[PDB]
Amino acid sequence: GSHAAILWNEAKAFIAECYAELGKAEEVADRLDSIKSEIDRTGSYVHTKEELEHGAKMAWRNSNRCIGRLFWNSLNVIDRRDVRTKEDVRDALFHHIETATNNGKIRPSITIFPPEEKGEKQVEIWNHQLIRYAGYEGEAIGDPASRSLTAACEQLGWRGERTDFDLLPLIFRMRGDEQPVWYELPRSLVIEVPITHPDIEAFSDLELKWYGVPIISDMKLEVGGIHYNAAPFNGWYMGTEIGARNLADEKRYDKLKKVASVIGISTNYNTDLWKDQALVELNKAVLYSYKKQGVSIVDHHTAASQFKRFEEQEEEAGRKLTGDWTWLIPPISGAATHIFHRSYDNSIVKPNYFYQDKPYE
Amino acid sequence: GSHAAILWNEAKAFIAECYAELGKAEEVADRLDSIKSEIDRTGSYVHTKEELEHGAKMAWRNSNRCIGRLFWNSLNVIDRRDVRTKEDVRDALFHHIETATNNGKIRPSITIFPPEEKGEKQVEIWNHQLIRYAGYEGEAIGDPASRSLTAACEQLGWRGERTDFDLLPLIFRMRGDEQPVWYELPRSLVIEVPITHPDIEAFSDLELKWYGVPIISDMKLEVGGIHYNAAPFNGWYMGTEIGARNLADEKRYDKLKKVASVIGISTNYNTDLWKDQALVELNKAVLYSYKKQGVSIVDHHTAASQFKRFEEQEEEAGRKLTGDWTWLIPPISGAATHIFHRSYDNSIVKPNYFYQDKPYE
Ligand code: HEM
Numbered sequence: 240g241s242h243a244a245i246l247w248n249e250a251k252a253f254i255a256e257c258y259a260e261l262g263k264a265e266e267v268a269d270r271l272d273s274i275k276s277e278i279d280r281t282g283s284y285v286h287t288k289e290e291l292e293h294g295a296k297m298a299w300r301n302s303n304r305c306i307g308r309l310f311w312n313s314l315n316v317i318d319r320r321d322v323r324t325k326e327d328v329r330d331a332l333f334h335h336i337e338t339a340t341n342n343g344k345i346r347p348s349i350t351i352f353p354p355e356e357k358g359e360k361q362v363e364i365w366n367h368q369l370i371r372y373a374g375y376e377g378e379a380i381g382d383p384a385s386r387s388l389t390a391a392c393e394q395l396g397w398r399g400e401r402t403d404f405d406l407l408p409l410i411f412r413m414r415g416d417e418q419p420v421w422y423e424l425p426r427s428l429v430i431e432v433p434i435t436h437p438d439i440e441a442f443s444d445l446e447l448k449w450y451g452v453p454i455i456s457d458m459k460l461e462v463g464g465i466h467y468n469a470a471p472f473n474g475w476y477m478g479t480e481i482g483a484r485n486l487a488d489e490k491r492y493d494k495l496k497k498v499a500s501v502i503g504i505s506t507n508y509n510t511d512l513w514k515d516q517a518l519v520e521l522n523k524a525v526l527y528s529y530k531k532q533g534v535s536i537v538d539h540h541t542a543a544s545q546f547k548r549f550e551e552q553e554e555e556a557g558r559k560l561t562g563d564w565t566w567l568i569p570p571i572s573g574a575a576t577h578i579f580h581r582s583y584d585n586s587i588v589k590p591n592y593f594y595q596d597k598p599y600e
Numbered sequence: 601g602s603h604a605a606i607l608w609n610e611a612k613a614f615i616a617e618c619y620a621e622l623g624k625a626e627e628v629a630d631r632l633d634s635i636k637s638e639i640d641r642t643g644s645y646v647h648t649k650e651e652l653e654h655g656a657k658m659a660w661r662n663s664n665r666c667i668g669r670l671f672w673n674s675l676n677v678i679d680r681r682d683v684r685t686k687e688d689v690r691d692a693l694f695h696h697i698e699t700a701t702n703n704g705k706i707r708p709s710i711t712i713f714p715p716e717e718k719g720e721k722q723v724e725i726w727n728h729q730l731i732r733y734a735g736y737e738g739e740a741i742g743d744p745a746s747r748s749l750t751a752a753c754e755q756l757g758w759r760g761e762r763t764d765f766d767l768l769p770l771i772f773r774m775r776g777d778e779q780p781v782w783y784e785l786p787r788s789l790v791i792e793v794p795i796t797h798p799d800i801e802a803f804s805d806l807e808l809k810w811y812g813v814p815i816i817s818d819m820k821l822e823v824g825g826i827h828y829n830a831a832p833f834n835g836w837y838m839g840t841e842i843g844a845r846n847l848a849d850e851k852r853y854d855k856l857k858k859v860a861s862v863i864g865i866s867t868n869y870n871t872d873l874w875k876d877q878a879l880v881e882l883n884k885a886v887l888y889s890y891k892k893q894g895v896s897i898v899d900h901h902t903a904a905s906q907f908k909r910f911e912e913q914e915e916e917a918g919r920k921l922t923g924d925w926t927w928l929i930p931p932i933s934g935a936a937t938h939i940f941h942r943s944y945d946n947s948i949v950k951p952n953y954f955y956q957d958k959p960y961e
């Protein structure tokens with residue numbers, strides 16, 4: 240009743256906006272008629288390859304928290320709405336990792352899986368990211384952010400070796416099944432980068448490493464009223480995400496004090512700004528390491544500079560710019576970028592990516 | 601008509617809340633009667649020494665953008681509502697600098713001047729801060745943030761030597777005068793700190809320096825409906841304000857590239873994170889310098905730690921905590937403090953400090 244009404248309204252808004260950008264303004268009338276009859280006949284409608292391809296791009300462009308939006312139109316859209324089995328999904332996820340990694344020269348990609356029909360999911364991905372480390376407790380081992388998902392995986396037959404860098408398996412659920420299935424990731428498919436410093440040799444004593452490609456797999460892609468709960472996407476890392484957050488947060492790997500030790504500075508006084516010096520060196524190490532192994536990465540300055548060019552292009556295209564200041568500013572030297580010195584409208588514009596409730600926990 | 605109504609409403613709210621914290625709950629009834637008769641007789645009311653003293657403190661406690669709120673109850677309130685002449689104001693401002701500086705051991709203080717009567721100001725301070733550097737243009741000289749006020753001062757007979765660190769004079773306007781008066785600051789009253797590094801001797805080649813005490817003199821203190829447009833206040837600096845903003849912003853002194861040069865690093869590649877390393881060293885220098893000359897300063901870690909204790913005390917006192925995340929997080933290593941990892945309610949609670957339109961510009 241009310242669900243068939245919201246769907247039609249969001250479809251009219253999307254097709255108009257989408258076709259206007261694609262230069263197919265005359266085809267709007269004939270397409271909306273087909274959609275109206277499709278919603279009445281089945282209860283939903285199917286996007287064309289061109290529609291969801293641009294839809295996923297528009298969704299990226301409207302992502303307020305993303306600093307890499309300059310490259311929105313170069314997104315590699317992989318259409319996998321034809322998957323029916325768990326092997327199909329697995330192979331699609333494996334393919335995503337392979338094609339996105341591209342031997343280091345990372346390609347911003349997204350794999351589209353079947354959307355929700357009558358509110359029920361067809362494929363449901365449990366992983367936050369396709370490649371992520373596990374986490375445990377007695378004393379902290381691994382990535383604390385992954386604790387709940389690690390426990391869920393263990394309740395399904397999976398067991399990790401309990402090192403700080405255990406690769407969580409792929410874990411997803413198919414329509415009609417009560418519990419999800421899991422598949423260990425083939426190591427040959429996963430690129431990892433050991434962290435070393437360009438001037439400090441002792442840095443390798445920390446035995447730090449991180450994976451090459453972040454692939455967010457738990458967000459919902461909303462395009463024209465259609466909910467693609469399963470649609471993993473990826474870009475390349477921005478150094479700070481690793482050296483200022485993942486390896487620095489007290490609630491994550493908490494490595495600042497150990498970094499200070501290998502670089503030769505004391506952790507006695509705050510006034511010595513040891514945490515800051517540790518952050519700079521750890522972040523330099525991250526950037527040097529990724530570049531050395533031939534894996535794409537971008538520093539926060541270059542990234543902000545690229546985002547500045549994005550702001551200019553949106554003004555040039557006549558589109559309103561939206562952004563979340565609190566997420567756009569880098570966690571290291573934010574005042575050194577232009578983002579800090581201006582304000583952004585945090586309005587939500589569709590199509591976009593949204594958060595969804597975690598099946599575990 | 602409507603002005604006498606708003607005033608009475610804000611007075612009832614303030615006296616109740618103020619006396620409840622002071623343990624004088626029974627005196628509320630008799631005090632509100634006197635106030636009601638005072639508003640009818642004159643059109644406004646006069647605070648008691650105890651009322652505005654605690655009012656200024658409560659105002660500090662409600663300042664969402666302030667990280668040093670832990671020390672709210674130790675505020676040194678100086679009552680100068682008895683000033684009538686321009687010499688009175690000048691001496692009060694001179695006194696403020698002297699007593700607040702306290703030979704380096706800075707004392708958080710506030711000088712209260714007469715409030716607005718029928719919407720018109722009695723004393724109007726033009727300075728953003730009592731002690732601040734001037735700014736000019738052909739090529740950039742001094743502090744760009746002070747350009748407009750510097751031009752206004754020059755249109756009044758004042759002329760600076762055009763160095764990067766010229767002290768702007770005190771400039772204020774008395775009721776009944778069309779234009780403001782100005783007084784040069786006595787150098788013996790102003791403590792300045794030359795910036796040097798603990799390990800790098802070449803740092804002094806940058807010839808950087810900053811003043812010791814920041815005294816915001818252009819904000820409005822609102823207590824119980826009474827508007828104290830002139831009420832300068834001060835705390836001590838947090839290193840980052842100087843080394844990550846005042847001396848780092850491209851729109852301020854823009855010293856990062858010159859800092860990189862004296863510390864021995866290249867400014868060629870962003871991936872080398874030279875801006876970040878420059879920021880750490882400049883900030884360490886700031887903290888070491890202030891401490892060396894015996895002038896109070898606090899690093900961002902200690903400051904966040906102190907703010908954490910403030911959050912706990914407000915929960916313990918039963919008061920709702922308000923804060924602006926975007927201003928509370930430090931501009932250097934924000935994720936290394938607890939502030940970054942939580943959210944804050946940006947609701948405005950009175951009494952508080954507000955922005956007011958600049959008479960110049
Ligand atoms: C191409 C390079 C990319 C860079 C450098 C970049 C960078 C960033 C950064 C630094 C954040 C903050 C992450 C954090 O602090 O947790 C972010 C968030 C985000 N970005 Fe990207 N991004 C890229 C590509 C993409 C792509 C391919 C999409 C989608 C098609 C996208 C969607 C978003 C979304 C929705 C968020 C918020 C996610 C969250 O709330 O956890 N980004 N991005």
Ligand code: HEM
Nearest residue numbers: 660663665666667668671708833834835836837838898953
């Ligand atoms: C005692 C030590 C103090 C410290 C360490 C401290 C620190 C800070 C910091 C770091 C900011 C940000 C400044 C910027 O980024 O421009 C701030 C803003 C502010 N603080 Fe403080 N503060 C202190 C005392 C005070 C006192 C004495 C009051 C008032 C009685 C106060 C009122 C505020 C207000 C209203 C703002 C916002 C001002 C603006 O928007 O420009 N603070 N504080």
